Amino acid sequence: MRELARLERPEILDQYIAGQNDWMEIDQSAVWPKLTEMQGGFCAYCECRLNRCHIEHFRPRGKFPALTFIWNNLFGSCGDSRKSGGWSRCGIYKDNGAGAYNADDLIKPDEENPDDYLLFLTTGEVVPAIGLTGRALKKAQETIRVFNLNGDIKLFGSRRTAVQAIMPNVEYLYTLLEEFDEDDWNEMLRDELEKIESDEYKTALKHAWT
Amino acid sequence: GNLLSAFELYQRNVGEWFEMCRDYIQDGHVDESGIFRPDNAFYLRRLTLKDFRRFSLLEIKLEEDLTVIIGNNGKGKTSILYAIAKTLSWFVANILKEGGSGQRLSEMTDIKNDAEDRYSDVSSTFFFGKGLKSVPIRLSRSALGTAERRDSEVKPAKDLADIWRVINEVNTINLPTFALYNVERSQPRREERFDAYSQTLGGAGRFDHFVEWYIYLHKRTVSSSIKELEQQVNDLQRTVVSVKSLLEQMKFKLSEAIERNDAAVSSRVLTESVQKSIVEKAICSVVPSISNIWVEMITGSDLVKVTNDGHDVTIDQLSDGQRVFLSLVADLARRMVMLNPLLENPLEGRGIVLIDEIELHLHPKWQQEVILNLRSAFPNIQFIITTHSPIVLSTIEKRCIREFEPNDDGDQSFLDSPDMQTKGSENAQILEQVMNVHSTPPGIAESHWLGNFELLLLDNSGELDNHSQVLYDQIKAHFGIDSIELKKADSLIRINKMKNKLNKIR
Amino acid sequence: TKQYERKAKGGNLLSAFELYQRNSLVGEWFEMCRDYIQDGHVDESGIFRPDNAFYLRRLTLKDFRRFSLLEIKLEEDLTVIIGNNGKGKTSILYAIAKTLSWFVANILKEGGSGQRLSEMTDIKNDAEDRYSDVSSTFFFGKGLKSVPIRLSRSALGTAERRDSEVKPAKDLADIWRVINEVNTINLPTFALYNVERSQPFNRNIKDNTGRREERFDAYSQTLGGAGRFDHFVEWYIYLHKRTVSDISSSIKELEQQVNDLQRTVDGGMVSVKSLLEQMKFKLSEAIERNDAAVSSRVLTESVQKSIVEKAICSVVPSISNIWVEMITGSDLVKVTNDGHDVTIDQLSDGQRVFLSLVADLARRMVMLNPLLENPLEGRGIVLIDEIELHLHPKWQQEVILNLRSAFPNIQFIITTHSPIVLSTIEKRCIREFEPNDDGDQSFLDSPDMQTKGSENAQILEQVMNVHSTPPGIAESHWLGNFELLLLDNSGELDNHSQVLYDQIKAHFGIDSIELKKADSLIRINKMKNKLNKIRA
Amino acid sequence: RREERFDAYSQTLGGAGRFDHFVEWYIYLHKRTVSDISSSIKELEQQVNDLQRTVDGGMVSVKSLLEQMKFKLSEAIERNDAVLTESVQKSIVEKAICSVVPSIS
Ligand SMILES: Nc1ncnc2c1ncn2[C@@H]1O[C@H](COP(=O)(O)OP(=O)(O)O)[C@@H](O)[C@H]1O
Ligand SMILES: [Zn+2]
After folding, report:
1. Which ligand is closest in space to the CA of residue B76?
2. Which of C332, C346, C355, C390 to mutate to test the pocket of ligand 1 (most atoms within 8 A of CB)?
């Protein structure tokens, strides 16, 4: 899960007002390009490559009708409700699978940095970060539960596979700490971390490298 | 080039229309690969199930060549094959006899238990060339004790089958093969062309039938004008002690020639020697690790022998998996030869074949081979198969695969292809991405030790503390010094040590 | 004698029993035998454990079928036999089943005969000695560490006959039978489940003659290979009817009817005397059956029902509930399968076959272990051929765990060709069957690799000798070829390597494992080259 | 097994005999006798000789058959050349039956 840089509000959200208007009315192709700018064609919660995708309200439209055409509440999630099929993580699972949850105790990735709450073990699991107590632990534990970031085998399997593929390159770089001097080695680590902006499951790959 | 209109004109009247119908059925070409291709292909295009068993509504589009249906137990894979088989029974019945009746849906079992509208529908659409783009058939049944009965709609199946039957009666044509091979395949008068349709949609593929048939064909084919043969028989009879065996053989040949001569045009058949050769070739081409099959009588008992992985063995030396599969292929080949006498290669005939649990009783080794050569040997058959095997799926393109979602509560409208390409993929990936199973068993504690070990290393700034050492020793003790798990643990130690050293060099 | 007394006081079961038989301190010796059989403890997990366990330790086959000599050591809990040659694996299970027939026969009837070896099929065709032996050694606590049994058969016209040696098995079975006759004890379960268990279910179910209610019906057809799922259904419906009915109300009603009939005969109607005698007989029979049921110390039908239902629901993942519905003057067993209420005949073949196995086994255990709080914690030996038959991979990952949890004291001897099943089992439990061209093999080996908790891909390669990728598909070799090309061209993407890279990308996709591995190879080789240049 | 020597005692005092066992045993004997190539060569040699005599007697119609049989004989000889007890056993029984049973020649 990445810390996302939200910046500019698109023009179409000015027109539509809560109460009168419905999400069925608004055009979705108007909204996407700013989210694609924000996120980089990657899922907000799991960091899949987006292809089947939907606009996700972080607080849902039923419970919170105030936050229906508000730019802070919107996110590009993976999975497609329209298709005849079962999707079991992120936006779709938050509604259907997880069921009962407090919305306040979840990581909103535009506001908060995930890195302090979540840790990505190279065996493939996401866990609470080392040393959390009480409330911060509860947010980490519920973000993991409600977005189903372990419980989906497709996601877990895809994420493990990716990290395990690079672990030869991780071990080989840190051996050459010794013989290289600091300016050579710090340029190399910058160069590897440059690549993984364009890669799937980037936060998991980050924790493997650093 | 509408086939039904041409046939109607033929029935009312005449040679021109007959020829048009015959050419529509018989015309084809040999492609670049040397394979005969009918100009007008016959296949099942679409299937819809409404309130049938577990399905409230299901729609399936089928591939022309191969469709593999996958899912957990109780997802309805067998139900789908049953539905198709019952539909195909209407073609078979009407090819055999005018106004013949096919099979029907059960009022006890086949209606969905909580269907508000207490009836079930199986709707199928078949394709037969550009002249007959859509042949819709619907099988319907109302639940027991309902006042209002829903009628099946089968006339299009009957009409099409009538064309095959009538044209064949006048001039021999090639006919489509329909066969179902269910899980019961594993359970322990002369021949005539339409015996190929006997028990084709249940009871086909039984090892014992093959062996008996094969020995029979061998005995007949061990060791040609009728007038010339009659003259030879007469000359041999006049000579008749040592030539008595030869006379009996020649009398048999004469009787067979007369029978063939007397036999009707519709029931035209290839020689027993040719039939034998084609079946042998089919078996050897398709079945993993069988290069040759033959009959021996030199012990003094009739024994079918095979060359299995370069060793000549009795057929009773085959595993049950290999026997069952051999039986399936042999049976299919036999039917194809009987129904396609006019083709150079009768195995290039048309048809629809259904196979349930293709991997039944197969060791992983042979699972890797079984679908490699099925499509090569039978290029114009539409195969609709079910499997539980990731090894099988590793040999098949994703376009051929139709998967049920794991959390399907029987509502979903379409079966779809997996997102990942399966052909040439690792089995571990297919397990996780296609079959929704972890590569390691989650119920085993030892499966989590490496994860736990990593967490302990990260908690203690990368240094091997007392607790991490204990777990390391457990991993080493359990998996062994040469294990992949221990190597991963060692790797974690090395990386974390180096990371920590860097952190100190702040 | 004094010697028998010493051995018996030392804990020898046979000596104690011999003293019991001769004197029939008779009560003391009986109690010693009964305590040897019945004593046990509850472990820390809350599971009952007999103090004196019963299991098959060793099996030897001599000139049997394709085996000149084969020796197998079995585990107390679980042994799994793996290999291609399934006709030899099945022969091993058959040999065991025939031996187990001797215990079953003698528990049922004094001097009962088990099954014998065939002169035609069981003797190896090229045996010099022209006879066959099946030797088994059983264990029954520290008091009886070795119970040897040998089944033998000679060819026709041999100078000397080979007789079976079965007396130890008979002696042990006699202890169970005789002690049980005096005071009800728990008895061992023996069952074989072959590939035959996959048979179509005949729905129309037979009227209760009441053989199915008898305790020793648990041994009926127990080593036949299919089990009797039909018997389960009959027995289960019977249990249901008894639970809905009141018990001894028929006796009370019969008591009232006999009293009314007695008054009529006392009132001068001598014509009804014949009917009174018939009814008195019926009453006496009902009381006796009730008393025998009372004497057999058997569990209430309600409790029996509950135990079996729980077992089925626990072991069979798709089944959450099972019950009897009374409709149309015809009792139907229904199940909740995947959240939907269906008849047994509506179940998938995989579900039904597995249900049948567990149902049959649970029924037998409940009938044979009436004195245990959990009757499924009884003793016994169960043989299962091709346990993965009809099971999806997800079920294969749970099947052994579920069985072993439900039946903690049963010795399971099973065959499989599933790596997924093997991933849940320790290598010590695994015996590999790799025969020669003649079918002959001397010992069965544990694999070198630990299987429990290992990845299935590794088991495929290291245990089952199957590649992770299908060798007869070209695309399976592209990554290997790609790597070779990279290594040949000093780590730089040449025209050939680039083409293949593009092919991999086009075929497997941008987010494929294969492409990621290729990308990894490029990155590592580029870094290796940079290091080489710095060093130069 | 019907060819096992002690099968001769199988249901011997049961009253019916086992005529079914005879038939099976006789077919077995036949198959074994056909299979050995030297008797087949001798039989083929005899057939070739009989056919050659017919061709020499003016029946030109059987020349095609003679050529086929000569080819079969040459092939059999080429396949490795080698008395079967089974052949003798068969002959003994045939003679016995024909001698004792008047209507059977
Ligand atoms: N009439 C029915 N109503 C509801 N569910 C049914 C009915 N008949 C069968 N089923 C369900 O259908 C499933 C069996 O489908 P089947 O084709 O045998 O499965 P599989 O795909 O494993 O072969 C089970 O879940 C069973 O409960
Ligand atoms: Zn997502």
Report:
1. 1
2. C346
